[PDB]
Design a binder for this molecule. Structure first.
Ligand SMILES: O=c1[nH]c(=O)n([C@H]2C[C@H](O)[C@@H](CO)O2)cc1/C=C/Br
Ligand SMILES: O=c1[nH]c(=O)n([C@H]2C[C@H](O)[C@@H](CO)O2)cc1/C=C/Br
Lengths: 188, 182
């Protein structure tokens, strides 16, 4: 009944805080490009939505641009989640769920998304799960302490408190509404 | 492949400008509630999104609220478009297409939606047509002159008129029954 039902291989979602070595960890899979569908966080797309840089505007002016940005992330995820592929295995960096449970949720808390904006996304999330098929077999959680995450970023800029909030949300979601097995890794 | 594919009866879309007697014209179908799936513009829903009145905010503060409002309209329309029904015929007041081609498009022009917000909705619109099945067999266009729609800003209604015109008289293919709603 749902879109992209039955059309998807075994799917692994790589999840974690910002600066938890997600990009590094994925490069290790990069040499099986030919047997793995390797889909990395489409930040490229969020930085150019037909010219417009949504990611910039989001940070620059959050109360205004959070809503469209998040909506756009949710889309790009779905495109990833639903892309067709001949490959026997699919690996995504993050997913619709982390967008919904970590980022949208946090932005609600620190009032980046007002009640109206948040509720629109949530009605959309609720609709999407009714309509579109999101194949998820294993999440690999690259666990870290905020402290550590913060550094990787100081190495390569968002506040430590922010990363802490994202950490708590990732923790709530993955350690303590998503059932399918969660492989916890130590990314310290 | 698409969601709600194969699950929809013959579908008629009543389209027209604001104040072109759409609501009136639908009430005439209201007495076949039992054989017709009669789905009216869900303005109720846009006025209360779990407490919040999006329609208000949109008018009150356009540059800020246009984006979520439209996004929400788009959803409510999809919910209508895709709702299940045993009935042999389905009739909707407006649709996803008039949201996209008339309202979003206008708001782009008068810069209610900036380039980044517009584009997000469009990408979404593009995605939606790939993924969700929108059954549309006949559009009934209740044509009018802005003037009249008015007597029931005028420039706004004029722009909405031009867009409705471009879309329905001069990309959506499936037969268009033009009525005169003057
Ligand atoms: O919802 C989000 N909000 C958000 O701000 N980001 C930012 C964080 C980082 O700056 C950059 C790369 O992950 O994108 C990601 C997501 C979702 C990924 Br799913
Ligand atoms: O997309 C829309 N945007 C919009 O602003 N409206 C407004 C016009 C009027 O004030 C009121 C009655 O429909 O709602 C309708 C739609 C319907 C789209 Br389908």
């Amino acid at each position: 009944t749902k879109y992209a039902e039955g059309t998807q291989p075994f799917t692994v979602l790589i999840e974690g805080n910002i600066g938890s070595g997600k990009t590094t960890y994925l490069n290790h899979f990069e040499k099986y490009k030919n047997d793995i569908c390797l889909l990395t966080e489409p930040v490229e797309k969020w930085r150019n939505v037909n010219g417009v840089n949504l990611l910039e505007l989001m940070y620059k002016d959050p109360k205004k641009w959070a809503m469209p940005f998040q909506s756009y992330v949710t889309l790009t995820m779905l495109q990833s989640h639903t892309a067709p592929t001949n490959k026997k295995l699919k690996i995504m960096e993050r997913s619709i769920f982390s967008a919904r449970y970590c980022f949208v949720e946090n932005m609600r808390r620190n009032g980046s998304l007002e009640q109206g904006m948040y509720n629109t996304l949530e009605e959309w999330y609720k609709f999407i799960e009714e309509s579109i098929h999101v194949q998820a077999d294993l999440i690999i959680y690259l666990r870290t302490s905020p402290e550590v995450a913060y550094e990787r970023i100081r190495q390569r800029c968002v506040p430590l408190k922010y990363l802490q909030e994202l950490h708590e949300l990732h923790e709530d979601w993955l350690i303590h509404p998503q059932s399918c097995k969660v492989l916890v890794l130590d990314a310290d």
